[PDB]
Design a protein around this nucleic acid. Sequence first.
RNA 1: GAGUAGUGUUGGGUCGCGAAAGGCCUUGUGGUACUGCCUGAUAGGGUGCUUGCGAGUGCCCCGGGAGGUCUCGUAGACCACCAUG
RNA 2: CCCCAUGAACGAGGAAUUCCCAGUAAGUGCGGGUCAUAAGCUUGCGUUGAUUAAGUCCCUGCCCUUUGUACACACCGCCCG
RNA 3: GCGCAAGACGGACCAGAGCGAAAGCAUUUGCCAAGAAUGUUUUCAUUAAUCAAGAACGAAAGUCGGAGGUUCGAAGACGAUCAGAUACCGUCGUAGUUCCGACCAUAAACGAUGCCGACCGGCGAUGCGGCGGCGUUAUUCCCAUGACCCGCCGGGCAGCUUCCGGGAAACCAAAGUCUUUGGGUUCCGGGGGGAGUAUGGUUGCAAAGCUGAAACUUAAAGGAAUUGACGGAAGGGCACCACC
Lengths: 101, 61, 135, 213
Amino acid sequence: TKKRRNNGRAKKGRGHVQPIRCTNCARCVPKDKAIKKFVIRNIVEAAAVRDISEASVFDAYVLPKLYVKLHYCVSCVIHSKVVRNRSREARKDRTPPPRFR
Amino acid sequence: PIKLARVTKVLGRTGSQGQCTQVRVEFMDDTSRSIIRNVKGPVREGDVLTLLESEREARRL
Amino acid sequence: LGPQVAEGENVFGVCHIFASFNDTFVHVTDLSGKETICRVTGGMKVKADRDESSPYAAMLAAQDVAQRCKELGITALHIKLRATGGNRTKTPGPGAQSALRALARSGMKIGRIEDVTPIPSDSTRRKGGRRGRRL
Amino acid sequence: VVDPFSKKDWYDVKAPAMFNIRNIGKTLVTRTQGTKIASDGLKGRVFEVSLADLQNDEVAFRKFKLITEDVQGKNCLTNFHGMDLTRDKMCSMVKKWQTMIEAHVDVKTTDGYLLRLFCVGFTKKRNNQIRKTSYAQHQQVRQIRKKMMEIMTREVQTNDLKEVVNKLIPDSIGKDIEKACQSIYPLHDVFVRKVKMLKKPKFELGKLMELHG
RNA sequence: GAGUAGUGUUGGGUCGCGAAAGGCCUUGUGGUACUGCCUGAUAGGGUGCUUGCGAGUGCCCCGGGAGGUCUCGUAGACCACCAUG
RNA sequence: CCCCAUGAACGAGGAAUUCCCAGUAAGUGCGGGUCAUAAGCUUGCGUUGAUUAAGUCCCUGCCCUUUGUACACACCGCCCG
RNA sequence: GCGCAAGACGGACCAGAGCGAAAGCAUUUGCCAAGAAUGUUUUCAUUAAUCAAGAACGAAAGUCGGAGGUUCGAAGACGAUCAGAUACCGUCGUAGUUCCGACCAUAAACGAUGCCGACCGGCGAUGCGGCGGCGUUAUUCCCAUGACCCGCCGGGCAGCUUCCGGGAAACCAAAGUCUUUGGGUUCCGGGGGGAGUAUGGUUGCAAAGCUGAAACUUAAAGGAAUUGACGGAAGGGCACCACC
Ligand SMILES: [Mg+2]
Ligand SMILES: [Mg+2]
Ligand SMILES: [Mg+2]
Ligand SMILES: [Mg+2]
Ligand SMILES: [Mg+2]
Ligand SMILES: [Mg+2]
Ligand SMILES: [Mg+2]
Ligand SMILES: [Mg+2]
Ligand SMILES: [Mg+2]
Ligand SMILES: [Mg+2]
Ligand SMILES: [Mg+2]
Ligand SMILES: [Mg+2]
Ligand SMILES: [Mg+2]
Ligand SMILES: [Mg+2]
Ligand SMILES: [Mg+2]
Ligand SMILES: [Mg+2]
Ligand SMILES: [Mg+2]
Ligand SMILES: [Mg+2]
Ligand SMILES: [Mg+2]
Ligand SMILES: [Mg+2]
Ligand SMILES: [Mg+2]
Ligand SMILES: [Mg+2]
Ligand SMILES: [Mg+2]
Ligand SMILES: [Mg+2]
Ligand SMILES: [Mg+2]
Ligand SMILES: [Zn+2]
């Protein structure tokens, strides 16, 4: 029985897609299927913010941020809970979850 | 420095075993600075907390 | 025991903080980088292989090299943070963050923060094998 | 056993006359044992310096590589070597619905320094724009590329290193590309993302002395 | 005077920006708003500070005047054991 | 059961764990059961009477919901050489 | 940290986007030929559709030679884990992975949906060309032109939606126009096994490829969906015989 109409991978009207190695595994996955996640955070985290802010030789020095694109092979995600399974109907919704309050 | 603090609201209870209360802090110096803080034992709104480290912020247990 | 400078002006070293998931280095050099002042590593401060990486190691290592440089007249540290890079992880290990916070506390001065992980334009094949590393 | 650190000696790295602030810092060299000349061991170094630190008014994310050449007796003489963007900013610019454009030239200055200049740009979302994506068609892109290329070539080729560096501090060149390309497509962030060095001419004291003061 | 002089550019154009000297020939507008910085106009394009955030509010120049811990809300929480029945 | 003697272990209890939120825990005696003679047990009864919490799924335990299934004598299932 | 060298690979930008008959195809720049679509009051005048036989190209692995060998890496060697592990995990490492030159013709080569053609609902989007339309911008006026903007047309890649109709149902605007059964055409299936095996023929250098039975054996094998039960799957939830 066909589960998804799009077959899990985003490939449409082209034959084959350049494969990429997973972040976590190293398992090989085509770039279309790969569960992708972008990460923008600050180099230093929550508390050490306030701490380091004092130790500067600069006034109003704004911390640099760290930018990383992750790919997660289908397995690795579900283990990391970046992605979890949902109901037959609620499957169909491709609208990204509400991290915006 | 030693500081004082005021309870504006009670939000939730942080803890593994449900120990800490996660509460919201005004400063009694009439400043408008608002910091979330972890407190142990019973807390109702309006109470005053004494902070030995006053620049610290709240993390989720 | 070092550079001769007034009380206002701060002497700058360049600190490389390398956090893999195996262990951290806190490595302090000149501006050029061609001379190392002091280098302490995670597996050095703590004895067990498990603990090699863990933040606690970062702590110790950092406190120590920072001390040793506070000796030699280096107050301020430019920081170049590093994740293992290349084909493997681009996240810095957990150690780095801690380490950084640590050699703040020792009373060091912090210059610019910069992120250098070697990043490929396009790499050699990664060390697992097609079906991945499974466990 | 024997402390390696008492045979050290402190030296002073002073930048050239191009920027404002002179002393970039201190450098630490083991004294001459006579088998090894310390003035020589010190001779070959690069320094990675934020523009913010050289000249007070500017942006944090442009970095300069500076080479020592001669030593004046606890003075080091630094000539321009390289230039680049801080990785942070470079990543900050690149985003997901816009075309990116890159070009590069190899140019000899009038005095003979050989540089490699890299050029980065982006398609910018128009201000009322409803469509999700600013992409440019291949031929548009190539047009742009060619113009980026043209501009900086003429900018360097005519001038010596002195004026080149002088153009690189504020980034005259970037703003130049951006204005010139508005016709073909609205370029957005446009920079010289990297400056390299290929050949320096045979080293000459006098030339450098003039560069310092 | 003259949208001339000078100055300015992606493709051109009947161009854009925009002086002064000096005279002549007798007044030679009012009402009403605003205004952070950068670029290139009070337009267009970037980019901000006020309380962490979201609202408000203010941020051209001068003089003088006094009144001061601006107001209202507020989650902003993120650091591999194990066969068979 | 009672009188004299005998007067030993025991110095607040290791890894683990049990019961408990207000006349309650706990101390303390008392009744009923068993009983000819018997309560270190049980079942009740008053008396003296608190520390702490009004919260959380970490652990343990079961419940729903989604989900996969070649099982339905239902995983102690089925099944491959 | 500075240089040098070698071979690989083209990140981010990169998308339910493009292009190609399919395999497949992303650094710049020049040269070489193709190609769809669009536009057209050009030309030819039925030259077309599908196709036994026969051909061209055809991932990866594999095979001959040559060159080259960074990384990864079957084989193998150790080190672990385990009752055992000749397996998952780790340190190495041959063939191979790379380029040139010949072979091989198979992949879940998948949209598991032949190709040409007609008709049958909407709705917004997107890529390419075209056509029209205020208004912004490339500074201030004129035309070009480009960028956004509002539509319209023809091809595309898709999507959402719907008692069009189908369908065993999952689902499909085609899998529709089917007992109200006929637009043209090609390949091809006939219970499960035995078996894509035996044999012969044929291709290859070989590994194999194409073509391809029978004796026998067997009441089911299978497809969708439904309640269960279970999961070493994810979420909530409670209980001082769970904790704080
Ligand atoms: Mg299934
Ligand atoms: Mg394919
Ligand atoms: Mg639980
Ligand atoms: Mg059954
Ligand atoms: Mg096609
Ligand atoms: Mg690239
Ligand atoms: Mg044939
Ligand atoms: Mg091949
Ligand atoms: Mg091969
Ligand atoms: Mg060979
Ligand atoms: Mg072994
Ligand atoms: Mg192995
Ligand atoms: Mg290896
Ligand atoms: Mg062939
Ligand atoms: Mg086949
Ligand atoms: Mg098939
Ligand atoms: Mg056919
Ligand atoms: Mg169009
Ligand atoms: Mg038009
Ligand atoms: Mg269309
Ligand atoms: Mg029929
Ligand atoms: Mg049959
Ligand atoms: Mg056959
Ligand atoms: Mg045969
Ligand atoms: Mg089924
Ligand atoms: Zn993975």
